[PDB]
Amino acid sequence: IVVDPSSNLYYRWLTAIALPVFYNWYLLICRACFDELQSEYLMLWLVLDYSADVLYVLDVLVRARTGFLEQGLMVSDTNRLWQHYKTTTQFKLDVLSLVPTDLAYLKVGTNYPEVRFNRLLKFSRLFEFFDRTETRTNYPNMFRIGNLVLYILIIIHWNACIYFAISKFIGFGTDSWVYPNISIPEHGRLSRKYIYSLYWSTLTLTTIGETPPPVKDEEYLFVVVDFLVGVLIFATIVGNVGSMISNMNASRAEFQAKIDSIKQYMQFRKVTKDLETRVIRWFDYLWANKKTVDEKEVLKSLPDKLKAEIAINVHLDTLKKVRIFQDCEAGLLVELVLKLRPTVFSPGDYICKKGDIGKEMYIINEGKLAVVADDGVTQFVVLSDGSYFGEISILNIKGSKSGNRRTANIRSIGYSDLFCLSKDDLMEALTEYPEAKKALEEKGRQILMKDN
Amino acid sequence: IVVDPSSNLYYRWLTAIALPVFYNWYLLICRACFDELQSEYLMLWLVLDYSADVLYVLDVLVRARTGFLEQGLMVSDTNRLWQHYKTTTQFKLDVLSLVPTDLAYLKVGTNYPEVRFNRLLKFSRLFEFFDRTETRTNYPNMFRIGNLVLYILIIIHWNACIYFAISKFIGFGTDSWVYPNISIPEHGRLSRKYIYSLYWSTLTLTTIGETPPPVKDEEYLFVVVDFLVGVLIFATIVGNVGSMISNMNASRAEFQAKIDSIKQYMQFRKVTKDLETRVIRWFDYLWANKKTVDEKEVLKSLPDKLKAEIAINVHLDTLKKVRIFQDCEAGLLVELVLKLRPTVFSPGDYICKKGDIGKEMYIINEGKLAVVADDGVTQFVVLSDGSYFGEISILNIKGSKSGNRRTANIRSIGYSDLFCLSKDDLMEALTEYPEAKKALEEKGRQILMKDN
Amino acid sequence: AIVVDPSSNLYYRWLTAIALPVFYNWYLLICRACFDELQSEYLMLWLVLDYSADVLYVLDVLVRARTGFLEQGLMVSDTNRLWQHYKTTTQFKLDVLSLVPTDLAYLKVGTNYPEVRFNRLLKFSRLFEFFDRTETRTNYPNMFRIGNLVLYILIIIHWNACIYFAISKFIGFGTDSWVYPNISIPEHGRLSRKYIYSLYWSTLTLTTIGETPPPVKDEEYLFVVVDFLVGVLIFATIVGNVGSMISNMNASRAEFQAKIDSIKQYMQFRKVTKDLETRVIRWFDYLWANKKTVDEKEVLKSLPDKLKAEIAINVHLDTLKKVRIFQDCEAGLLVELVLKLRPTVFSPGDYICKKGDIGKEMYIINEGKLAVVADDGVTQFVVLSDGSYFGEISILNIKGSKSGNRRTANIRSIGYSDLFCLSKDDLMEALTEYPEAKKALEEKGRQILMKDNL
Amino acid sequence: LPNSIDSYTDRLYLLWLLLVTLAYNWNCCFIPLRLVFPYQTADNIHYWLIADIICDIIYLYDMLFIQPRLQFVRGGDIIVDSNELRKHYRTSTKFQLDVASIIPFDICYLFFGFNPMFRANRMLKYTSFFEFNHHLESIMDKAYIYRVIRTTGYLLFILHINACVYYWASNYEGIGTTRWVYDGEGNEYLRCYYWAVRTLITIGGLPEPQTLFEIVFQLLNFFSGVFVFSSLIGQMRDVIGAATANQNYFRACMDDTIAYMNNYSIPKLVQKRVRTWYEYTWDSQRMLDESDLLKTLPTTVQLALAIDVNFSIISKVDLFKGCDTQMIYDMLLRLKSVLYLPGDFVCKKGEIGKEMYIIKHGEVQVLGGPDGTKVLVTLKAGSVFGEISLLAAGGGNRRTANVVAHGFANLLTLDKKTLQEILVHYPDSERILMKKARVLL
Numbered sequence A, B: 001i002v003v004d005p006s007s008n009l010y011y012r013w014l015t016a017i018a019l020p021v022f023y024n025w026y027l028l029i030c031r032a033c034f035d036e037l038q039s040e041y042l043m044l045w046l047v048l049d050y051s052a053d054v055l056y057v058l059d060v061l062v063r064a065r066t067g068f069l070e071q072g073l074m075v076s077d078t079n080r081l082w083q084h085y086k087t088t089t090q091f092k093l094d095v096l097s098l099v100p101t102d103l104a105y106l107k108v109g110t111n112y113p114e115v116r117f118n119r120l121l122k123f124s125r126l127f128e129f130f131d132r133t134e135t136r137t138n139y140p141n142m143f144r145i146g147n148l149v150l151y152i153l154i155i156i157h158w159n160a161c162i163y164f165a166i167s168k169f170i171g172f173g174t175d176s177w178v179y180p181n182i183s184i185p186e187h188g189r190l191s192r193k194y195i196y197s198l199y200w201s202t203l204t205l206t207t208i209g210e211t212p213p214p215v216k217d218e219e220y221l222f223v224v225v226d227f228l229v230g231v232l233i234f235a236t237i238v239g240n241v242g243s244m245i246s247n248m249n250a251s252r253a254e255f256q257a258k259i260d261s262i263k264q265y266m267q268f269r270k271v272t273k274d275l276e277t278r279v280i281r282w283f284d285y286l287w288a289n290k291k292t293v294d295e296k297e298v299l300k301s302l303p304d305k306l307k308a309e310i311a312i313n314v315h316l317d318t319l320k321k322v323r324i325f326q327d328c329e330a331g332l333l334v335e336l337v338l339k340l341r342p343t344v345f346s347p348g349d350y351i352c353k354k355g356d357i358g359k360e361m362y363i364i365n366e367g368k369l370a371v372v373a374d375d376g377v378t379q380f381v382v383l384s385d386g387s388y389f390g391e392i393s394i395l396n397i398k399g400s401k402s403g404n405r406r407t408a409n410i411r412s413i414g415y416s417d418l419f420c421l422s423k424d425d426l427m428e429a430l431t432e433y434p435e436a437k438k439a440l441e442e443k444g445r446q447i448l449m450k451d452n
Numbered sequence C: 001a002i003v004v005d006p007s008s009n010l011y012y013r014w015l016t017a018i019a020l021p022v023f024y025n026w027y028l029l030i031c032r033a034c035f036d037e038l039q040s041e042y043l044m045l046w047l048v049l050d051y052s053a054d055v056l057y058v059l060d061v062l063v064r065a066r067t068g069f070l071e072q073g074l075m076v077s078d079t080n081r082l083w084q085h086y087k088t089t090t091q092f093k094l095d096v097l098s099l100v101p102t103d104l105a106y107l108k109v110g111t112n113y114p115e116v117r118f119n120r121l122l123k124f125s126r127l128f129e130f131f132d133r134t135e136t137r138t139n140y141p142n143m144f145r146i147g148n149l150v151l152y153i154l155i156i157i158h159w160n161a162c163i164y165f166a167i168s169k170f171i172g173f174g175t176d177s178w179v180y181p182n183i184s185i186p187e188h189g190r191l192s193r194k195y196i197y198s199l200y201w202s203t204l205t206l207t208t209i210g211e212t213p214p215p216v217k218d219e220e221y222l223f224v225v226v227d228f229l230v231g232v233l234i235f236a237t238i239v240g241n242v243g244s245m246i247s248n249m250n251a252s253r254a255e256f257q258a259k260i261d262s263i264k265q266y267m268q269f270r271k272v273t274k275d276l277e278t279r280v281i282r283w284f285d286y287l288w289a290n291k292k293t294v295d296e297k298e299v300l301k302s303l304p305d306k307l308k309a310e311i312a313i314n315v316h317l318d319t320l321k322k323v324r325i326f327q328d329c330e331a332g333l334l335v336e337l338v339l340k341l342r343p344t345v346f347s348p349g350d351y352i353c354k355k356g357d358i359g360k361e362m363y364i365i366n367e368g369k370l371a372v373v374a375d376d377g378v379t380q381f382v383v384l385s386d387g388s389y390f391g392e393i394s395i396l397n398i399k400g401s402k403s404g405n406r407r408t409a410n411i412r413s414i415g416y417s418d419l420f421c422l423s424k425d426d427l428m429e430a431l432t433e434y435p436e437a438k439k440a441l442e443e444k445g446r447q448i449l450m451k452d453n454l
Numbered sequence D: 001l002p003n004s005i006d007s008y009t010d011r012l013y014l015l016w017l018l019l020v021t022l023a024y025n026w027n028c029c030f031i032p033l034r035l036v037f038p039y040q041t042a043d044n045i046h047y048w049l050i051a052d053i054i055c056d057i058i059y060l061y062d063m064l065f066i067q068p069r070l071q072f073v074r075g076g077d078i079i080v081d082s083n084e085l086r087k088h089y090r091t092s093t094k095f096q097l098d099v100a101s102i103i104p105f106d107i108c109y110l111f112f113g114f115n116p117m118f119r120a121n122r123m124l125k126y127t128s129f130f131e132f133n134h135h136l137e138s139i140m141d142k143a144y145i146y147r148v149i150r151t152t153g154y155l156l157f158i159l160h161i162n163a164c165v166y167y168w169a170s171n172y173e174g175i176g177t178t179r180w181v182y183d184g185e186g187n188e189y190l191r192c193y194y195w196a197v198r199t200l201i202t203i204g205g206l207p208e209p210q211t212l213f214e215i216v217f218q219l220l221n222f223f224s225g226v227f228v229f230s231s232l233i234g235q236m237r238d239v240i241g242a243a244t245a246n247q248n249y250f251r252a253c254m255d256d257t258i259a260y261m262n263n264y265s266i267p268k269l270v271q272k273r274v275r276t277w278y279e280y281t282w283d284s285q286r287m288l289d290e291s292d293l294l295k296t297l298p299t300t301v302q303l304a305l306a307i308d309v310n311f312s313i314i315s316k317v318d319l320f321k322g323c324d325t326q327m328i329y330d331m332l333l334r335l336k337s338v339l340y341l342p343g344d345f346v347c348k349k350g351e352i353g354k355e356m357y358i359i360k361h362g363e364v365q366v367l368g369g370p371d372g373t374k375v376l377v378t379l380k381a382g383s384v385f386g387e388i389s390l391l392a393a394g395g396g397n398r399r400t401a402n403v404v405a406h407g408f409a410n411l412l413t414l415d416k417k418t419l420q421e422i423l424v425h426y427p428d429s430e431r432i433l434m435k436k437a438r439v440l441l
């Protein structure tokens, strides 16, 4: 058995081993700095440290079983996985974090749990869990805000523990800056100990500063160092939230810049008010219906195989209903749906009138068109989603009475999303299929004998 | 009657339903936590709650009879509108917003308006009104600072009500952190209560913290949570205002970047000082006359039908004054004005000199040119708006004594805006028009036998 | 009749000379209206400066009623049409509202209340025009953005200082702990102490620091909460303007550093050899250090075709006229050929063209020192210097040539060069309008081949 | 010492710039400290004098034995000879600032006494500090850590200058006169640095100023502290927005592709394949496409980056063995990079063949068994298959057998149309290619 690192079992393992790392950091620094809850609940921290050590042994023997991509394929040799695990420094950090340092409890009396600070070396696993969760989830900005709240909570708790350890080293209640005298039964409770030291670090690290002032030089130096660390950390968090917000509204900024540039251009060139109202309603439709991206730019970087699968998974059921593309080759149909290009029409906009130059084959997708008459609007046939027109104008049969003059008056009923297939893209895709090109020519010739 | 969401009537209803939702949020948390507004103005809040419920059932009927978009057409059958409204979670949120929880007033004696907290669930209408106003209005940055001040004033008011509720739970006048004893006639007034709670929450959430320090564990924990919330609020405010300032001066930043890049190129290639100050004065004109963006880049995001309609509505009314394009066809006119190119000429620049190859045909739009005589200030014919030149040399009619050479020296008096119609552009627009190409050629042969 | 050009230097000097007293009127009219000891003590100075400001204001009306405006690209010089175009403008209404003679009421109140002279503040658009023209005129745009931000928040902080002193004068002096102290004490009653402590109070309020005494009254509480919301908005726009200044300062360096990081990621992907890796890194560091890092087809893309052609003339035409085959050709052909010239840069050790290669390019040397060497390595024959050229024969394609469009030389770049490349296809695309010059170029190349080898 | 220092690939020059940076930072730090604070006492003056002599000896050694020997580029080529390097340093602008820095104003120690204000010309050698900072930014792998380090160093220097100016204001108003000034209880520089931090970070809790000079000092110091805090926040924002830009651009384009596929209701197998391609593309290249990177590079570095990756691999192909090297260079430039998922068919049996594939970083398997699943040969990285399809036209040759990808194979695809568009320039190589097509077909 070899666990795939890109699978779901490995991510569930990342959660089940990134819980005791956060446990080890948070509760080991409070157990080492307070010594009031370590002396109260010894069995609970013994059971939780035994479970964290069992999870760390399982972490070593699972991290020694994860595969890695060597030349595109997942390697499965366990000796190669064990040697690739041995040659890197994360095995050194794991074997340094899995030293049995708990045998020193027999010498110290188990009242000093700061000997378990070797177990804080597995922080790359927790950072890997945070990176994999913000990769996997669909709310990356909300997970980044939650991760920044968790980072400032870790830093607040570690600073509160550091302030209580410094207050224990100096002496409780001897000064005005330190934590007060714990022989008084009000300040001697563990709850007010932790919550007031958390309040002091909340006031200090966020650069508010309404604590009692330092009266000695060690307290002055610690408050200067602590204000400097707090202003650098909280300027980093405010810059991170600012960069995240400026990345969140960047698409709205770019779309509003495009709308304002087009509106300033049409205010400069004196375009009429009905056409301006039409194009502003078109951009409002384009924004409110979330079609602001375009196919030609969102399918730019993808390869032709995945673009072919995306194109045949939408267009092939409509192109196989087309009469002239009924019995052609599957690679020709893949290239034909690759050559399709989308066009969006407003309601009331004419697709083509009588006598215009016909060189595009329109394929209707999520829209409704109709062939109107010359003067008035009467509905001869209403073409629905999955219908098509424009095959004669792109076949251009020699000996035709049409003369590349696609017939009728086609206008849009609603907001249509037409996929056009031009003459140049058809003759570009039809170079490598000569007998299929000849079959298209005789199919158009039979259409010509049907249309006299 | 079926309303459509892009109309003005739906936006007027969005205003009329974004009034009592904001009322419900603000004054329901105020009447829930203060207990003197509900005691004093009982009939006023009963009338306003009944009017909010009347607007809520009218909003339920409007969202039951609102239109959506499928296949580009506005959906008009009210039974399908009712099914599409009832199948989603907004109908569940409106029904949960209209549970009769006001029948507990006869149970508790009406002094508890906290049972109307289900009325806050209709927040999508307020967020939709904010998004539609940001789409609609022409001051997006001023509306964004108005939305930001309204959001942080809602949070400041909610935090003031939470602080007064916590002080009412703990006790009045028992500590230094809490609100003082309200039996004193100075601290007992409702204006003093609300404005001091607002001042407390502004000092807390606005990271200034001049409030007297906490005494007990609940007050310490609430001040820790409240200061961390204020740190996140300050980060959000700084990020939104910084991204808005970047969006406000991004156009000036990119034009300054292009100006300094062209200036760095001009001192890199060591151009003459006269050409350098000509480029500098042209960029000063281009910024002071708001012609910054380039029109071929502006007209790129639009579709082909709106591009052809805008190209007609700008260029065709000046193109039809050209006498060689009097009787051409409409599609030739459409692709002719689509393949046009506008340029702006500095004063004193020669458009075409006598003896140069005539490859472009220029028509004047909002300019004044003059035909000078051989590098002199003396002007023969001063051209004006609506005129043309360069039709003698573009067609290459056989029998030409000129031989593709512009025969006149043309200087620009001021800043002109010509339309450079190229020979290759006219030849590429004349591919699908062979009979109109021969008609243009015989018209040019007739006018060539007329002039020369 | 004299007409001042609005894009000239005299109009900008007038913008400075009229943006001084508007800014004076803002500062010292709100300070004289609120402090009431400046107006009592410096009466002659304020009447003289206000008379000078009114003389500058009527001269501003006389200048703005004679400045021109662009129609049809032409600067109009007809003063009657200029007066009509100014008369149909709301700025004329703002100017005639700004020059209402309120000195009758100002002497009726005893030349002691300058609150009546708040009509003079209406020329804010003139000061905004001055700041716009200075931020597009000066050579320090980021430093002027910082100075304009400092000046705007100094205007707001001074107005808040005047507002706080007016609120303290309305409520009472020393009746609370929040207000300004009792002015009967001669230390707290000095005017410098008044202005400096009130300015310090409004700075501590509007920048959200808060060392002020806490308010007592409800109006004081409401003014402090409104002033703290305005102060956190002011701190937000200060941090936003300084962050935008830093980003606009180092945007080009960050874009180049992201380009170098992308090139290093590509070379770590494709397993590029480390000698070529450090060659590309040293090449791009040289191109950044001598400020040619942006491609000139992307630099000159925003320029129109006439200015691009004129810049191409003024750079490349005096170098293209020194070439032997383009000595006697037409001016339009030379303008098209200097428009069609593309630049390429090289690094040391690279070959321009080798022996037996298909010669499709004509290289013109600029800012470089090439050398024609043999096949075995560095044995220099003739060190080629700046201004020279090669490849004018093999792109002509003379019929019956014994070389057959080859190179017959190995040309290396000793130092970094900035060559100019003229392709064969670009020469044929520029020679399609001059077939007589095409046959003349074939005749000159046939002459060169006849004197060399045939 | 060598005759010429390279100053780009020389670590000894970076060590010397670190030494001159330590000298200049010693001047800019310990000149206001000795100027304001009374640490320059009469029994400690010899230690400051030995440090000042070592500092001026470092400055004079830099001016006399190192800065003439820097290599530089005039006219494109690197200059080596020491006379022209010395003349380039002498006619430079760094020599004017160096010779203005090393003016011996310490001769006036005999006249006016020991005063560190006369050493204020030594802080004009900031060009060595900026050159060392630029060299360390260019020589470090990740620049954001050094931008945070430089911002922290400028913040600590500004706070040190503010502590010195506050101790000068305390000496000017008298020590312990008012409640605002420094009182004299503990360490002078430590409590003044505490006042400078609590003022210029705009924290508060200090004693209020009493008289007019103290209120003006507190106002100007709080305004400068507001602008320093704003510059620190904007600097960290610019550093984070420059660091996460490629990741945010890749995530925005992947979100655009996922939103388009969810707009068009594309099923979960194709969506999983698109997300798998985007995940492996981010894990492999750390960028979307490389053609939009390479199209902004100049032609010579495009040529060299094409040659050193693929020129030997195309030179092992027996088809283009007789053609021209410039035609091989053109098909090096016109190669297209694709990444094929595992289990994907690159050339189905019976399908039209129009491409030549070069496999790099991957393994493909030719499925030519009787049932269609027995592998024949595993073409590893660096192989070239499908080269015979570049010569037939129209229908021509069909694909003989099914070939699938074993793992994540990054094929290099050359089309037939791009090969013909290259071949319109080279008629002799086109004649060689069609006669090779005739003898092989």
Ligand SMILES: Nc1nc2c(ncn2[C@@H]2O[C@@H]3COP(=O)(O)O[C@H]3[C@H]2O)c(=O)[nH]1
Pocket: A358, A371, A380, A381, A388, A389, A390, A391, A392, A393, A405, A406, A407, A408, A410
């Ligand atoms: N003329 C015509 N075209 C129709 C009709 N019904 C569907 N169509 C399609 O509508 C078309 C629009 O123009 P085309 O020239 O492409 O070809 C025509 C047909 O394919 C009909 O009744 N008449």
Ligand SMILES: Nc1nc2c(ncn2[C@@H]2O[C@@H]3COP(=O)(O)O[C@H]3[C@H]2O)c(=O)[nH]1
Pocket: B352, B358, B371, B380, B381, B388, B389, B390, B391, B392, B393, B405, B406, B407, B408, B409, B410
């Ligand atoms: N040759 C010539 N052109 C004139 C004259 N007056 C106006 N024009 C226009 O000036 C022109 C310059 O360009 P064209 O050769 O294209 O065509 C010429 C005419 O349209 C005139 O007297 N002679």
Ligand SMILES: Nc1nc2c(ncn2[C@@H]2O[C@@H]3COP(=O)(O)O[C@H]3[C@H]2O)c(=O)[nH]1
Pocket: C359, C372, C381, C382, C389, C390, C391, C392, C393, C394, C406, C407, C408, C409, C411
């Ligand atoms: N063959 C040759 N070319 C030289 C010499 N000196 C300068 N050049 C130029 O170097 C060239 C390199 O190849 P070209 O084919 O363009 O043409 C040659 C000449 O223009 C020389 O001594 N021999």
Ligand SMILES: Nc1nc2c(ncn2[C@@H]2O[C@@H]3COP(=O)(O)O[C@H]3[C@H]2O)c(=O)[nH]1
Pocket: D347, D353, D366, D368, D376, D377, D385, D386, D387, D388, D389, D398, D399, D400, D401, D403
């Ligand atoms: N069928 C086959 N092709 C091979 C083998 N080894 C290398 N190749 C190449 O793999 C190919 C894949 O594409 P082609 O079908 O055109 O042509 C085939 C050969 O050129 C092999 O053992 N069998």
Ligand SMILES: *[C@@H]1O[C@H](CO)[C@@H](O)[C@H](O)[C@H]1NC(C)=O
Pocket: A171, A172, A173, A174, A181, A182, A183, A184
């Ligand atoms: C704390 O209080 C106890 C008794 O209240 C006292 O004996 C002890 O000295 C105090 N601690 C200090 C540090 O003063």
Ligand SMILES: *[C@@H]1O[C@H](CO)[C@@H](O)[C@H](O)[C@H]1NC(C)=O
Pocket: B171, B172, B173, B174, B181, B182, B183, B184
């Ligand atoms: C508030 O005041 C009243 C009367 O003055 C008193 O009875 C009450 O005890 C006070 N509240 C507290 C908490 O002391």
Ligand SMILES: *[C@@H]1O[C@H](CO)[C@@H](O)[C@H](O)[C@H]1NC(C)=O
Pocket: C172, C173, C174, C175, C182, C183, C184, C185
């Ligand atoms: C101000 O001081 C004077 C004398 O010092 C005193 O008479 C007067 O009442 C004081 N005013 C106030 C408002 O305190």
